[PDB]
RNA sequence: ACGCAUUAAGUACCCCGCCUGGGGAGUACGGCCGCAAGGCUAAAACUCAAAGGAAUUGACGGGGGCCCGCACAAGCGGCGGAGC
RNA sequence: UGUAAACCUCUUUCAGCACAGACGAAGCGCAAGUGACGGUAUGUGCAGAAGAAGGACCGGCCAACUACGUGCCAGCAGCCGCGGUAAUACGUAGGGUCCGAGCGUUGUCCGGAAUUACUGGGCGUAAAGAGCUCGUAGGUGGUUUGUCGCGUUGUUCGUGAAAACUCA
RNA sequence: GGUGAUGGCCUACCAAGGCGACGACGGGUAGCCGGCCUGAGAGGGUGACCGGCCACACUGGGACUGAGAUACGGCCCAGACUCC
């Protein structure tokens, strides 16, 4: 690109491929569950995972992934959601923190307790 | 906060002596762990981290303020490595440990936290003092009456006082004169990898 | 279109050094003469000269090579060119090979080497980075 | 005393009628510590043989790079193979900063203050090729003056003149210490 | 890299077009041109973690040259019919 | 696991309990006195190791490994990818690693990204030269003879707030 | 004519021009800056606090007071909100 072309056109930088559209730039959004169901990951990995469809304060319909092993989520349960991709599920881009609001951390966890929100032993 | 766990674990995992008189190390040099025999793959980051940890626990310095060491050394116009070693040897803890008034750096830190010393006639009870040049370090009457300090002052017959450091008499007055030089200090390990890891 | 005589002359010099020539013939000009002044006094060109041709005065350049066949000039790149022109202040004079190179600077006195300009405190336009 | 640093042990496989045949090739750099660089890359049927061939190749292929004090002379544009590497002499204590292969070769050469930055196509073999090419592209001020028919004071700046004088005095002191 | 190698992709100079992972799609909307077929200018979302280039050896080819086997041809006698 | 632990000596910072206890005020008044903070900061004493440690990671990147429990389930996960009975990748255990009164997750922004290539990209096929011309504007100029110096650097004092960065 | 002060600030008449592809006017975005984060650098992002300016005061307007009005808790009118 010659100098005159540079002056004529200006150099345009990449437009960011923004991910995690739901929070619209927020580190957190609060939502209410609409359904609880299961889905089958892509061909390389087959399983039966648990995903929840939640209504957001930002009025966006996006599924979220259910961590841990056991959950107490039934339809119309206020929940908390964070940002994170998931490759096994193609239409999933969100997690659901445990130990906050009505979602508690699965019992019997002592390793990586902080990530799932569990208390100590006594 | 300081380290409260076992101290010999550090030498055992590090593969080199820290205090210097370890019977346990010479009994079993292999680092702790049910697999202290597994071969370790070559890693430049691994070795840089190894050197960083050894130096840090050797000087008892906390991770953040030792990053502060490294950035300050960069700030000074001299060479970063020797600037860092100067500023970390300037620690009052290391001063007392190497002047024969402290058996171990941890004990020097314990005594400084207790506050039994007078520096230039002003009471001080902080371990990480900045010992400038030409300064003078004292010891006060209750410290004198303290038993273990007496034992240390009669036991200071180990590795002799380095060049710029010296003790003048029974009262154990410590005074530094000139600029410590890397070659004469002969502090172990090489600043090369420390500076590389922090410049990462 | 010969739209950059300085660039063409430098290209001819470096190409002749690559092809292992001895004499390079170019149309003569005042700028060519003074640049030859600079390079010869620095010791990169063994000697220049200005002659007369069928139409216009020209010049032939005599180079040297290192005792082991070594090339005299390694790289030649222009800096201030038609369109993109570069100048420098008294303090920001360019550094080439950490001083091992010579940058031709146009200053009020004329064209002088980087060291001459730095010692005189004068500045101008850097012509070519010669190494 | 020589230095050997393992940089890249690789797995390769070749296919013939029966199927796939696995293989090994390795690269390693050797240096003395005063500015002698030796590289060797070879293939073999397993790691020990690969390393043996690599050390043999490194010994066979050597090179000497005149250093100033403890740092390179001027910045080097290392263009060769498939990567682009640039180098900049440094002040002391800062160290020798670069990528993996760059540091392998440089610490083998023995330098202790240098800056490098790989600029594309970082494959280790090409990177090392470019480092060696740049390192051999260095210039010695004395030989530059000799070629240009110009003397040391007029050719070389006073700063590196004094640096070379101090390095010479330090070398003389080290020789005296060793002899005594 | 295959290759170019003074009628350069070499070493420079001057200007102009153009590109920034693959689909989506040179397509949807829009503006312009055309009587049209359509042409010109030129998007986003969502999905994939790779698609592509020259080149190494295989493998194979209803691709070529040189070779061998009751492979073919010439002969006898056969099983696939029945019982066993 | 471990000098770790109990053990024998020690100092007991800081919190606990008391004493003294500032300056912050040549400041104000023709008045005798004027301090919320605070009866704190700060010194001196009293008995006591006595009141005091957790979090993430340990497949490669990536310094940290093994066994126990279920095996294409239950699940992990940053990318590669990890379980179809004997997992260093799931969970439990130990053990180890990093960090630390903070430790992780998430999200925004720079970097490596030379991955918008001025420094500092490419155009044959990997993405790209339009299909090829004349030619307006713009961009650019084959030589030397001549001045004004508006492109330019040349220096002198003359502006650049404080605050922030760099030196002491 | 008007302003503390020149001037389409306002009025009348004359001429048809002025701004425009070294991007007018249009659309979405958003207080500017000394600065903050990053980067060796150029550069990218960004405007927390402090500070230098700007504009705003339930939404839309206008005017008085004076050396000094966008007049936040000064005035009037209109809408909304709440209340007697
Ligand atoms: Mg860095
Ligand atoms: Mg001319
Ligand atoms: Mg250029
Ligand atoms: Mg090149
Ligand atoms: Mg080549
Ligand atoms: Mg590359
Ligand atoms: Mg890379
Ligand atoms: Mg050509
Ligand atoms: Mg090209
Ligand atoms: Mg794209
Ligand atoms: Mg298209
Ligand atoms: Mg259209
Ligand atoms: Mg079209
Ligand atoms: Mg190809
Ligand atoms: Mg082939
Ligand atoms: Mg037959
Ligand atoms: Mg038969
Ligand atoms: Mg039959
Ligand atoms: Mg007072
Ligand atoms: Mg007083
Ligand atoms: Mg006190
Ligand atoms: Mg007290
Ligand atoms: Mg974990
Ligand atoms: Mg590891
Ligand atoms: Mg590992
Ligand atoms: Mg199992
Ligand atoms: Mg795990
Ligand atoms: Mg551990
Ligand atoms: Mg970033
Ligand atoms: Mg580019
Ligand atoms: Mg293509
Ligand atoms: Mg084309
Ligand atoms: Mg076309
Ligand atoms: Mg002037
Ligand atoms: Mg002036
Ligand atoms: Mg000024
Ligand atoms: Mg000031
Ligand atoms: Mg700074
Ligand atoms: Mg008038
Ligand atoms: Mg007017
Ligand atoms: Mg009028
Ligand atoms: Mg505004
Ligand atoms: Mg600024
Ligand atoms: Mg930078
Ligand atoms: Mg920059
Ligand atoms: Mg701004
Ligand atoms: Mg202010
Ligand atoms: Mg402000
Ligand atoms: Mg003003
Ligand atoms: Mg208003
Ligand atoms: Mg008002
Ligand atoms: Mg108000
Ligand atoms: Mg009011």
What CATH number does residue C33 fall under? 3.30.1370.30
Chain D, nearest residue to B200 by Cα: D97
Same domain, C20 and C47: yes
**What is the residue range of C63's domain?**
1-73
Using C1' positions and the CA of A95, the closest nucleotide is F106
Q: Is A5 at the interface with chain C, CB within 8 A?
A: no
The beta strand positions in C39-101, using DSSP E, are 45-47, 50-51, 58-63, 76-78
User: What separation in angstroms does the CA of D3 have from each of B17, C2, C42, D50?
Assistant: 25, 55, 42, 17
The span from the CA of D22 to the CA of D16, in Å, is 11
Query: Which candidate, A83, A38, A42, A37, places its Cα nearest to that of A60?
Result: A83
Q: Considering its fold, how many domains does chain C have in total? A: 2
Same domain, C12 and C64: yes
CATH number at residue C96: 3.30.1490.10
Chain D, nearest residue to B193 by Cα: D95
Chain A, nearest residue to C84 by Cα: A3
Strand E atom within 7 Å of C11 CB: yes
Tokens linked to A82: 């964070």
Using C1' positions and the CA of A19, the closest nucleotide is F107
Tokens linked to A89: 């599920």
Q: Is D117 at the interface with chain B, CB within 8 A?
A: no
DSSP symbol at D18: T
> DSSP letters along A10-77, please?
-PPPPPP----TTTTS-S-EEEEEEEEEEE---SSS---EEEEEEEETT--EEEEE--SS-----SS-
Give the distance (Å) from ligand 2 centre to CA of residue C29. 6
Task: Collect contacts of B122-127 with beta carbons under 8 A, ≥24 apart.
Answer: B126/B92, B127/B91, B127/B92, B127/B93
Query: Which candidate, A66, A121, A56, places its Cα nearest to that of A94?
Result: A66
Tokens linked to A2: 């010659």
The span from the CA of A120 to the CA of D102, in Å, is 49
Contact list in B for residue D103 (CB cut-off 8 A) is 44
The span from the CA of C59 to the CA of C96, in Å, is 28
Using C1' positions and the CA of D81, the closest nucleotide is E1
User: What separation in angstroms does the CA of B168 have from each of B150, B173, B176, C74, D12?
Assistant: 16, 6, 11, 64, 69
Same domain, C60 and C82: no
The span from the CA of D121 to the CA of D126, in Å, is 8
Chain D, nearest residue to C98 by Cα: D74
Q: Which of D139, D141, D149 sits opposite C43 (nearest CB)?
A: D149
Contact A4 C84 (CB under 8 A): no
Contact B192 D112 (CB under 8 A): yes
Domain final residue pick, C51, C73, C95: C73
User: What separation in angstroms does the CA of B145 have from each of B33, B98, B188, C82, D15?
Assistant: 44, 22, 35, 85, 83
**In angstroms, what is the resolution?**
2.5
Domain final residue pick, C24, C39, C73: C73
Query: Which candidate, D67, D73, D69, places its Cα nearest to that of D31?
Result: D67
Q: Are the C-beta atoms of residues B161 and B149 closer than 8 Å to each other? A: no
Touching partners of C (3+ C-beta pairs < 8 Å): A, D
Provide the CB-side half-sphere exposure for B180 (13 A, CA): 26
Q: Chain C: give the shortest CA distance to residue A4, in Å.
A: 8
Contact list in C for residue A5 (CB cut-off 8 A) is none
Positions of chain E reached by protein Cβ under 7 A: 6, 10-20, 44-49, 57-59
Same domain, C63 and C95: no
The span from the CA of A81 to the CA of B181, in Å, is 57
Tokens linked to C17: 């050094």
Neighbours of D43 (CB within 10 A): 14
Q: Collapsing DSSP states into helix, strand and coil, what is residue B88?
A: helix
Same domain, C50 and C79: no
DSSP symbol at C22: S
How big is chain C, counted in residues? 131
Residues 6 or more apart in contact with residue B92 via CB below 8 angstroms: B108, B112, B119, B126, B127, B128, B129, B130, B131, B137
Report chain C residues touching chain D, CB-CB < 8 A: 42-44, 64, 66-67, 70, 72, 74, 97-100, 115
Give the CA C105 to C1' F154 distance in Å.
14
Q: Collapsing DSSP states into helix, strand and coil, what is residue D56?
A: helix
Same domain, C20 and C51: yes
The number of the ligand nearest the C-alpha atom of D77 reads: 4
Same domain, C93 and C122: yes
Give the distance (Å) from ligand 14 centre to CA of residue D125. 22
Positions of chain G reached by protein Cβ under 7 A: 22, 40, 44-45
Tokens linked to C79: 């800096």
Same domain, C47 and C6: yes
Same domain, C65 and C29: yes
Same domain, C65 and C78: no
Q: Is D97 at the interface with chain B, CB within 8 A?
A: yes
Domain final residue pick, C56, C73, C90: C73
Same domain, C83 and C39: no
Query: Which candidate, D61, D67, D110, D103, places its Cα nearest to that of D85?
Result: D103
Same domain, C101 and C131: yes
The span from the CA of D65 to the CA of B168, in Å, is 51
Contact B195 D95 (CB under 8 A): yes
Contact list in C for residue D75 (CB cut-off 8 A) is 97-98
Query: Which candidate, B159, B35, B193, B115, places its Cα nearest to that of D93?
Result: B193
Q: Chain D: give the shortest CA distance to residue C97, in Å.
A: 5
Residues 6 or more apart in contact with residue B151 via CB below 8 angstroms: none
Q: Chain B: give the shortest CA distance to residue D6, in Å.
A: 8
């Amino acid at each position: 690109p010659t100098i005159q072309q540079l002056v004529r056109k200006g150099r345009r930088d990449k437009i960011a491929k923004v991910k995690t559209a739901a929070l619209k730039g927020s580190p957190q959004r609060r939502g209410v569950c609409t359904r609880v169901y299961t889905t089958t990951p892509k061909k390389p990995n087959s399983a039966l995972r648990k995903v929840a469809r939640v209504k957001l304060t930002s009025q966006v319909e996006v599924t979220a992934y259910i961590p841990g092993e056991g959950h107490n989520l039934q339809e119309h349960s206020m929940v908390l959601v964070r940002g994170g991709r998931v490759k096994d599920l193609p239409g999933v881009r969100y997690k659901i923190i445990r130990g906050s609001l009505d979602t508690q951390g699965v019992k019997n966890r002592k390793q990586a307790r902080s990530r799932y929100g569990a208390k100590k032993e006594k | 906060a300081r380290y409260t766990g076992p101290a010999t674990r550090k030498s055992r995992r590090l593969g080199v002596d820290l205090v210097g008189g370890d019977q346990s190390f010479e009994k079993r040099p292999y680092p702790p762990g049910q697999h202290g025999r597994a071969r370790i793959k070559e890693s430049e980051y691994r070795q840089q981290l190894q050197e960083k940890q050894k130096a840090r626990f050797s000087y008892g310095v906390m991770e953040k303020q030792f990053r502060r060491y490294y950035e300050e050394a960069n700030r000074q116009p001299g060479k970063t490595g020797d600037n860092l070693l100067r500023i970390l040897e300037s620690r009052l803890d290391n001063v007392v440990y190497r002047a024969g008034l402290a058996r171990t750096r941890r004990m020097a830190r314990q005594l400084v936290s207790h506050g039994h010393f007078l520096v230039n006639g002003v009471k001080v009870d902080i371990p990480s003092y900045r010992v400038s040049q030409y300064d003078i370090i004292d010891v006060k009457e209750k410290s004198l009456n303290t038993l273990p300090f007496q034992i240390a002052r009669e036991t200071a017959g180990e590795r002799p006082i380095p060049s710029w450091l010296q003790v003048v008499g029974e009262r154990q007055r410590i005074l530094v004169h000139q600029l410590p030089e890397r070659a004469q200090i002969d502090v172990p390990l090489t600043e090369q990898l420390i500076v590389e890891l922090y410049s990462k | 279109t010969m739209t950059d005589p300085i660039a063409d002359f430098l290209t001819r010099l470096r190409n002749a050094n690559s092809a292992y020539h001895d004499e390079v013939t170019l149309p003569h000009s005042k700028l060519k003469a003074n640049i030859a002044e600079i390079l010869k006094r620095e010791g990169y060109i063994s000697d220049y000269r200005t002659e007369d041709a069928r139409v216009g005065k020209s010049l032939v350049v005599q180079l040297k090579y290192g005792p082991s066949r070594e090339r005299s000039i390694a790289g030649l790149r222009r800096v201030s060119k038609p369109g993109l022109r570069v100048y420098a202040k008294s303090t920001n004079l360019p550094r080439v090979l950490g001083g091992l190179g010579v940058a031709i600077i146009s200053t009020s006195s004329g064209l002088l080497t980087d060291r001459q300009a730095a010692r005189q405190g004068v500045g101008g336009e850097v012509l070519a980075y010669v190494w | 005393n020589y230095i050997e640093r393992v940089v890249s042990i690789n797995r390769v496989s070749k296919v013939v009628k029966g199927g796939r045949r696995f293989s090994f090739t390795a690269l390693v750099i050797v240096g003395d510590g005063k500015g002698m660089v030796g590289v060797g890359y070879g293939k073999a049927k397993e790691v020990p043989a690969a390393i043996a061939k690599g050390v043999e190749e490194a010994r066979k292929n050597f090179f000497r790079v005149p250093l100033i004090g403890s740092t390179i002379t001027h910045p080097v544009q290392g263009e060769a193979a498939a990567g682009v590497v640039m180098l900049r002499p440094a002040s002391p204590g800062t160290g020798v900063i670069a990528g993996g292969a760059a540091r392998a070769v440089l610490e083998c050469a023995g330098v202790h203050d240098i800056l490098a930055k790989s600029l594309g196509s970082d494959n280790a073999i090409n990177v090392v090729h470019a480092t060696v090419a740049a390192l051999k592209l260095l210039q010695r001020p004395e030989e530059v003056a000799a070629r240009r028919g110009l003397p040391i004071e007029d050719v070389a700046p006073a700063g590196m003149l004094k640096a070379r004088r101090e390095s010479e005095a330090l070398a003389a002191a080290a020789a005296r210490e060793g002899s005594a």
